[PDB]
Amino acid sequence: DKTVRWCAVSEHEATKCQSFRDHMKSVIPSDGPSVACVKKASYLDCIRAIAANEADAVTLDAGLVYDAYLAPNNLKPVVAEFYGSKEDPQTFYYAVAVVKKDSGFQMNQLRGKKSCHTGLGRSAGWNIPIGLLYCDLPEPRKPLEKAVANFFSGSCAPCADGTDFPQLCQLCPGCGCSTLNQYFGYSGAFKCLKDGAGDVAFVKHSTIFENLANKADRDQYELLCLDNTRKPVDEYKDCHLAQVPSHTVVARSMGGKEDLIWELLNQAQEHFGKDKSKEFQLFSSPHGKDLLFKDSAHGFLKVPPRMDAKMYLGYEYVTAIRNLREGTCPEECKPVKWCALSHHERLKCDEWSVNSVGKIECVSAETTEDCIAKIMNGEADAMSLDGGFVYIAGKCGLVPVLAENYNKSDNCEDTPEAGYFAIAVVKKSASDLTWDNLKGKKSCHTAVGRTAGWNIPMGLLYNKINHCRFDEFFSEGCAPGSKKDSSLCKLCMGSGLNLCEPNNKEGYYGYTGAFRCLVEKGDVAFVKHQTVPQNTGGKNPDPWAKNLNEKDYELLCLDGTRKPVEEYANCHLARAPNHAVVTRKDKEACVHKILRQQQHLFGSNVTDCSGNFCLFRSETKDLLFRDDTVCLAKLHDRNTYEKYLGEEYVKAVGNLRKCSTSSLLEACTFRRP
Numbered sequence: 001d002k003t004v005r006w007c008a009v010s011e012h013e014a015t016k017c018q019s020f021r022d023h024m025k026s027v028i029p030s031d032g033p034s035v036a037c038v039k040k041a042s043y044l045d046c047i048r049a050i051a052a053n054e055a056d057a058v059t060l061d062a063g064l065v066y067d068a069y070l071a072p073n074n075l076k077p078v079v080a081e082f083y084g085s086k087e088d089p090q091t092f093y094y095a096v097a098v099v100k101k102d103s104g105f106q107m108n109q110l111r112g113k114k115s116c117h118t119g120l121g122r123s124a125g126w127n128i129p130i131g132l133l134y135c136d137l138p139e140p141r142k143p144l145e146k147a148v149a150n151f152f153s154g155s156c157a158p159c160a161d162g163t164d165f166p167q168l169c170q171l172c173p174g175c176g177c178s179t180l181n182q183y184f185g186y187s188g189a190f191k192c193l194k195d196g197a198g199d200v201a202f203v204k205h206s207t208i209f210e211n212l213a214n215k216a217d218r219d220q221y222e223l224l225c226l227d228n229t230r231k232p233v234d235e236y237k238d239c240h241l242a243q244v245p246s247h248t249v250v251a252r253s254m255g256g257k258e259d260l261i262w263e264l265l266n267q268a269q270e271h272f273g274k275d276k277s278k279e280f281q282l283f284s285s286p287h288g289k290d291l292l293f294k295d296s297a298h299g300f301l302k303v304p305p306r307m308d309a310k311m312y313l314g315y316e317y318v319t320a321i322r323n324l325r326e327g328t329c330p331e332e333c334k335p336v337k338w339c340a341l342s343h344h345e346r347l348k349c350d351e352w353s354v355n356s357v358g359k360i361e362c363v364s365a366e367t368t369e370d371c372i373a374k375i376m377n378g379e380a381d382a383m384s385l386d387g388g389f390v391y392i393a394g395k396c397g398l399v400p401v402l403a404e405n406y407n408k409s410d411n412c413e414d415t416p417e418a419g420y421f422a423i424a425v426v427k428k429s430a431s432d433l434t435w436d437n438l439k440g441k442k443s444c445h446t447a448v449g450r451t452a453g454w455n456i457p458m459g460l461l462y463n464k465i466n467h468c469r470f471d472e473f474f475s476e477g478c479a480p481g482s483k484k485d486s487s488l489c490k491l492c493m494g495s496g497l498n499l500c501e502p503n504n505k506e507g508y509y510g511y512t513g514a515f516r517c518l519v520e521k522g523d524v525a526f527v528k529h530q531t532v533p534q535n536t537g538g539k540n541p542d543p544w545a546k547n548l549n550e551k552d553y554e555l556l557c558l559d560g561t562r563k564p565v566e567e568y569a570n571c572h573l574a575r576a577p578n579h580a581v582v583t584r585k586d587k588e589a590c591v592h593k594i595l596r597q598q599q600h601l602f603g604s605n606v607t608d609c610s611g612n613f614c615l616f617r618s619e620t621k622d623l624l625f626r627d628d629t630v631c632l633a634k635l636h637d638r639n640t641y642e643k644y645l646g647e648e649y650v651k652a653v654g655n656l657r658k659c660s661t662s663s664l665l666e667a668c669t670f671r672r673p
């Protein structure tokens with residue numbers, strides 16, 4: 001159709017929208033995008049109209065971005081307003097709790113303090129902090145402003161009924177909803193803090209930088225962090241209540257026309273964005289402020305497709321809003337929801353769950369990235385990950401809690417390992433094959449984004465050839481998780497929709513699968529140093545592996561040589577950080593504790609994995625954990641993805657950034673670049 005039906009709320013917005021259509025029809029050719037204008041009564045009416053295909057697009061505050069996500073509207077964010085520059089565009093703000101340096105209290109000591117709020121019902125100054133504190137408030141919690149006044153010893157809460165809740169105006173008597181109140185709004189809440197009236201202001205991070213000249217000033221303040229520590233205000237990205245999108249174009253989740261919407265708004269900012277045209281302005285109006293888009297906006301960015309509303313708002317924001325909206329609280333550790341990679345893993349997890357005495361629960365997802373996304377948003381808590389996805393999870397905010405260890409040791413739990421080895425395996429009867437001409441040969445990979453399967457060897461290949469078209473360097477291959485039309489899906493063996501999927505419905509997914517792919521169709525397999533021994537000499541009983549001999553396979557060396565499989569130490573491509581379990585920072589304590597308990601009960605201490613449950617039970621498919629996992633090891637100081645993986649591997653993965661096809665990585669780096 002190529003017509004975007006924008007939704008306006010007021011006669012003013014509908015006027016501006018019509019002007020927007022007219023000026024676009026004058027500069028965009030007939031084959032370009034256009035606008036149509038639908039006037040509805042409220043942001044809520046616009047949300048429904050988009051859901052019912054009566055409209056297409058509307059820009060929303062974060063609070064309505066949440067509501068628009070809920071059943072039955074199922075809208076999603078598709079285009080973002082930004083507010084800085086094209087070289088540093090500021091799509092999100094950060095709700096922060098700013099205090100005076102050295103005032104002697106943490107987040108869990110806020111009760112009986114004096115609080116400075118921007119306004120009653122506002123976002124960063126109320127709904128977010130009060131949302132996060134909701135269960136800390138004293139029952140009865142409705143009405144909210146009474147529970148809040150019984151929480152803080154006194155406040156400034158502009159726009160609140162003073163007569164009803166008089167403790168809420170101690171710092172601004174009467175609680176002026178106008179800016180005649182000196183502590184009204186963002187700058188006024190911060191003056192309430194700077195002035196000594198309150199002990200904490202709930203403001204945006206940018207409120208601090210625009211009310212303090214230099215860093216020496218900002219050093220006089222600190223931020224309250226959710227882990228009950230303080231950090232400097234400059235460290236707001238690592239110390240905030242929530243990340244909030246400033247203004248979000250939303251659309252239908254299927255058939256929403258996001259690409260048309262983006263082309264419409266991309267073309268619009270070129271012609272009519274900040275300082276582009278004297279004839280028309282997207283970001284102002286002679287009919288009123290903030291019509292359709294914010295007058296402060298400098299342009300638009302496309303929201304990465306993997307993003308849904310929960311991911312976009314962030315976990316912390318959703319938690320706070322859930323609490324206030326639902327108006328209901330919950331009453332040891334929570335049992336850990338493990339995310340299983342499809343039904344092959346879901347079965348082993350279920351046996352784990354029933355034998356765990358209630359401490360492990362299971363969720364499923366069809367890809368690793370989908371699982372990481374459930375852990376991010378709270379639908380799950382933990383899983384083990386190849387280092388390549390440890391990297392991505394960290395980019396997405398998750399943290400490693402325990403490592404898989406593979407070396408036999410009298411003290412495995414407490415002995416860091418240096419890593420395994422990424423190797424290129426070939427068939428010895430193919431004597432020609434050399435690391436210096438795989439060009440046009442056929443490749444087998446554990447999965448896109450995995451360390452030995454992909455990051456290491458494609459890292460090296462991208463240095464040699466300096467383009468990312470790996471499916472054209474190889475004639476064909478199997479790299480589960482590639483684009484379905486890729487020649488790196490051709491050698492895969494899954495049936496139907498399972499072909500090339502990065503789960504065990506694709507028999508070539510994983511270390512064993514990449515090796516099977518080599519035996520059966522390909523010329524080179526990128527796997528770990530242990531994989532050929534694990535599947536030869538009868539150790540793997542399946543018909544394809546039964547008769548394979550270790551000696552029939554060889555390792556390609558970096559120097560162009562070839563050694564046997566047992567000689568990986570002098571003939572590998574790189575070290576590979578062990579696989580690790582990841583979770584949210586708020587589940588790190590419980591997951592570290594629960595897993596160490598579980599592996600005492602079902603780890604490598606176990607005699608006869610036939611009689612009892614065995615979390616690391618050596619089957620073929622590395623279900624949940626790698627089949628050669630000896631124990632889960634403590635991480636000590638190496639507890640971010642950078643520290644756990646090490647500078648080495650991180651610059652390795654980083655060098656591949658331009659080639660990345662990970663939709664989840666693009667989504668998380670959009671929320672934190």
Ligand SMILES: [Fe+3]
Pocket residue numbers: 122123124
């Ligand atoms: Fe606001």
Ligand SMILES: [Fe+3]
Pocket residue numbers: 386387450451452576579
């Ligand atoms: Fe791996």
